[PDB]
Amino acid sequence: AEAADRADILYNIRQTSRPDVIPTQRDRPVAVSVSLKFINILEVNEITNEVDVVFWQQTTWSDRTLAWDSSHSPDQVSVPISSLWVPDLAAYNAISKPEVLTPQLARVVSDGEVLYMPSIRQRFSCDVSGVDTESGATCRIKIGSWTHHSREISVDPTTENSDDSEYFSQYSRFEILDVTQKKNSVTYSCCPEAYEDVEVSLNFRKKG
Amino acid sequence: AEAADRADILYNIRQTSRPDVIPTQRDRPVAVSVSLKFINILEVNEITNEVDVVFWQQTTWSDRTLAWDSSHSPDQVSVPISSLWVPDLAAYNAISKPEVLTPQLARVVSDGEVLYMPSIRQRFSCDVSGVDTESGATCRIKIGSWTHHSREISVDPTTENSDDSEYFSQYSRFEILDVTQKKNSVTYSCCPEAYEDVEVSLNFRKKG
Amino acid sequence: AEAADRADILYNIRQTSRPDVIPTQRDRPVAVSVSLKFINILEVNEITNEVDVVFWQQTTWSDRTLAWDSSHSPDQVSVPISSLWVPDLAAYNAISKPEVLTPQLARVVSDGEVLYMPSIRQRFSCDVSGVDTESGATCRIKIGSWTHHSREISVDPTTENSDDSEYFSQYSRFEILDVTQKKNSVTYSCCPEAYEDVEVSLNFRKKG
Amino acid sequence: AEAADRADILYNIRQTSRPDVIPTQRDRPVAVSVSLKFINILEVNEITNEVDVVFWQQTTWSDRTLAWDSSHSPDQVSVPISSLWVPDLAAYNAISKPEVLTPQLARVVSDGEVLYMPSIRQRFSCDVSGVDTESGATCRIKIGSWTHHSREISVDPTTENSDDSEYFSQYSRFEILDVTQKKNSVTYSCCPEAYEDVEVSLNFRKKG
Amino acid sequence: AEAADRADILYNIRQTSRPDVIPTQRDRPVAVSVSLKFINILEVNEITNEVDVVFWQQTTWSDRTLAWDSSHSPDQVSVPISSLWVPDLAAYNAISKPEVLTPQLARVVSDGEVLYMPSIRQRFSCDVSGVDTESGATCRIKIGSWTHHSREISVDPTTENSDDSEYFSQYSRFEILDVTQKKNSVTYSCCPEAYEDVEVSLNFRKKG
Ligand SMILES: N=C1NCCN1Cc1ccc(Cl)nc1
Ligand SMILES: N=C1NCCN1Cc1ccc(Cl)nc1
Ligand SMILES: N=C1NCCN1Cc1ccc(Cl)nc1
Ligand SMILES: N=C1NCCN1Cc1ccc(Cl)nc1
Ligand SMILES: N=C1NCCN1Cc1ccc(Cl)nc1
Ligand code: NA
Ligand code: NA
């Protein structure tokens, strides 16, 4: 006999959780990590500077309100994102809504760590010039919390321990040369607070 | 120990939320301020007089029924628009529904001030003539309450509007020459009362 | 101190509207007036006899179960259509589902009179022949109740007036010559009863 | 002073609605009739053997769990299909999901007879060869229950006979030569039971 | 009089299904079998290495929490998937969301065995090179659980012989030369556990 099973954990999470309440820990912002693992580049237009790509948006953060004693029960459960709070990230230069290609489930660990990694197809406005050259083009995608400023949400790249083209389609007409990520904190007109973002630089080119 | 946290504030807002009730203060109309920050100009057809544009629609208004004492609690919260009343604005010359590219969350201040600023991609019917000339074309976009007349909702350009081209994409095939906002008050045959609107004149041209 | 405010009125409507129940008074059918205000004519094709049109579909009818004494209270409110019964109108020759470009709110008057006027973009299969001539083309659009027969819903064209181009976009590649309506009552092979429709005739042509 | 009105009948149907429960009368299958009233033929590609069609899918069956004494009550009511059980019909050769152009309402008679007649636009994979000839093409469309076998649902062509092109648009680029039906009973490798379908053959040709 | 009817069964399922809870047996992984029956090949593009496929994704697994005594009651029922737990399968190389063409119902047998077989149209990124040769092309489709690792979900190519062109449309411009399945267990850089998938190799070519 155990202390709890998945049904108990999920039941408790659904019964509470509060999807609309940001899990700030006292006076600290929620530390969100986000990185883009590119899977494909389906269309590129050097005249209009538009690209159509697919990527896994690995997203992580902690939500202590989800934690549970796992000394005698499962250590993790897959949870519908509709049942928990998730960062309100947006790509500033996206020109289409994200088309989520995978089941919208996050993975919650008994300590409150949450991983959400949907595969997404989305179009963007970025620098496509040079794509047809050896040095390639460098398309920058900026992602960050849409409505939470720096005192509520911070964004940093996730860690990386693999090739930038690790999961990139070998059948794409393009190939990846380099993928880098840099964090930023920007203040805009509408509001007095600063908003953080991660800038992902996709350096790619048309294959020979 | 505080008086309340985000969970409590959001709970109170959700529980008393009358999304379908315009927050008129007595008999005064709800004063709505609107201004467009252009992000991109994607499709332009001078033959059909049609254009595709991406813009942030900064919308502000006061809803006193949302106010709370923040002396010992958070001063603001991000709230899903489905839990609040929002102006029923519509672009009169739009020929496509608004494609909202950002999380649909409004920011609510403890005094009742609300800010909703979605990034929208929408197609419009306007004058594209001259877009390929030095003077460029001037496309006018009209926005106002669809069902609330002047005595229930007033719409005015945002007083501070200096960032109209601040976020415009340097990668667009077009460039902005000027953005002007103006207010109107029209009476249409269908009905007796007058409906206010804001007219945004986008003077732009094709690079080259 | 008044008798009631919008919050009270909308609360009562939401609690008792009965959206699935046609508001027939005794045994008299619900008199639904339908009037199309043409806003734009977009992608016309004389080869396939298809056309894209944008119009305000002014729809009016009365629902006595919505009336309230507005002696000392608002005499009108905007209500989400999901909270009211609305006629099940359908465009017989439409070849695409209606794209509603406006907030789906109807205006309900204290005496029970209801007005719903969505701006719609929809494609139709009609006669485009002669669109390039001085006499132009005459595209007929048929609209009527899909499941309520003549004894339950009566559709009547509102003899609004002339000036059918009052709200027609000056930027369209086409122009409106004239708009006329007429009432039909058809018995289909599926069923014994008769279903009525208003047939709007749109005579238009490409601007010379 | 009647026995009941529409509000009472629709209240009882909604309250005891078992939308996910096939209403088999004891151990007898549910007898479903279906005939397709072709309204239009919009896209025809003889290269890829694909066609875009608009048709009224006249569907009828009996659900005795809906009946009510109509001595002094309405003889019938229109009911949102989401509140009733409907056959899980699927076109085996469709290559796009059905686009329902009409309000999703079914008509229920006091005896329990039900009629659901959506107007549908759908793309199909069929023989388009000889569409440009005088003999025309014969595109066969197969429709049957997707998850209910012959002992639970039987499917038969509607006995209702009428001009094939009876409601076919006169503005289509094509015209109908003839429409014949055929009832099949097939056994598929996945499952041990037999599944029924109605095969509708659309003999049409392009206009000269 | 029986022990139970479909109404009772579906009611118990609706009340106790727990759709967000994977039905792991005691502590073993849920054995999921997957088999793709190809129905059609459309929109092939050898330049971009993309193809549109229509297939029945035969999916089976066991959920003993659904079992019931059918000695005096129906042995099976069709259940809306929203009322059941279903494997969170995803096609790794799909570049469009799956378009489900059939009613989203699964078949649940009284012993607890579940079958879900939606017909799906979806675009893929794969090797289309050689489609115009006698050897044809070989497009591999990889499908596995997105958030459940090998210890929670195992995926296996159904063990059974079946003509690959059994249900393939005779009107497609392409034909199937052969179809083979391969099982895999993969560890992704994001996570420590291994995730299983089945890779289906579709060898097809353009018909002469
Ligand atoms: N995160 C961003 N990007 C541009 C402006 N902004 C901040 C912001 C703040 C509040 C609301 Cl409701 N919307 C946006
Ligand atoms: N804002 C506008 N534009 C055209 C007509 N109108 C006013 C209006 C009034 C009432 C209802 Cl239900 N809908 C629209
Ligand atoms: N309004 C029309 N047009 C064609 C047939 N019809 C009448 C009708 C009657 C009942 C149901 Cl459920 N659906 C449609
Ligand atoms: N319509 C038919 N005939 C044979 C198979 N099939 C499709 C089908 C049957 C049962 C389930 Cl759960 N899913 C899909
Ligand atoms: N099955 C796959 N493919 C890529 C990563 N992954 C595993 C995985 C783990 C956790 C969450 Cl929330 N999402 C996906
Ligand atoms: Na454990
Ligand atoms: Na300005």
PDB file of C-alpha atoms and ligand atoms in Angstrom, chain A residues 56 105-107 115-117, chain E residues 92 145-147 188 190-191 195, ligand 5:
ATOM      1  CA  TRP A  56      10.419  22.400 -29.935  1.00  0.00           C
ATOM      2  CA  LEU A 105       0.602  18.339 -21.782  1.00  0.00           C
ATOM      3  CA  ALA A 106       3.238  19.571 -19.348  1.00  0.00           C
ATOM      4  CA  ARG A 107       5.312  17.272 -17.162  1.00  0.00           C
ATOM      5  CA  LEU A 115       8.461  21.126 -18.211  1.00  0.00           C
ATOM      6  CA  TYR A 116       6.336  22.026 -21.197  1.00  0.00           C
ATOM      7  CA  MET A 117       7.809  21.339 -24.613  1.00  0.00           C
TER       8      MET A 117
ATOM      9  CA  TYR E  92       7.529  13.611 -34.908  1.00  0.00           C
ATOM     10  CA  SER E 145       4.054   9.138 -26.888  1.00  0.00           C
ATOM     11  CA  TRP E 146       5.075  12.755 -26.399  1.00  0.00           C
ATOM     12  CA  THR E 147       5.240  12.982 -22.598  1.00  0.00           C
ATOM     13  CA  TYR E 188      16.299  13.033 -26.057  1.00  0.00           C
ATOM     14  CA  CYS E 190      16.001  17.344 -22.869  1.00  0.00           C
ATOM     15  CA  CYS E 191      15.266  14.433 -20.730  1.00  0.00           C
ATOM     16  CA  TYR E 195      10.695   7.432 -25.260  1.00  0.00           C
TER      17      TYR E 195
HETATM   18  N1  LIG F   5       8.885  12.630 -26.833  1.00  0.00           N
HETATM   19  C1  LIG F   5       9.608  13.677 -26.892  1.00  0.00           C
HETATM   20  N2  LIG F   5      10.067  14.281 -28.072  1.00  0.00           N
HETATM   21  C2  LIG F   5      10.864  15.456 -27.741  1.00  0.00           C
HETATM   22  C3  LIG F   5      10.866  15.536 -26.210  1.00  0.00           C
HETATM   23  N3  LIG F   5      10.060  14.395 -25.750  1.00  0.00           N
HETATM   24  C4  LIG F   5       9.807  14.094 -24.323  1.00  0.00           C
HETATM   25  C5  LIG F   5       8.969  15.094 -23.505  1.00  0.00           C
HETATM   26  C6  LIG F   5       9.069  15.106 -22.087  1.00  0.00           C
HETATM   27  C7  LIG F   5       8.309  16.017 -21.325  1.00  0.00           C
HETATM   28  C8  LIG F   5       7.448  16.911 -22.017  1.00  0.00           C
HETATM   29 CL1  LIG F   5       6.506  18.041 -21.106  1.00  0.00          CL
HETATM   30  N4  LIG F   5       7.354  16.896 -23.367  1.00  0.00           N
HETATM   31  C9  LIG F   5       8.070  16.034 -24.116  1.00  0.00           C
END
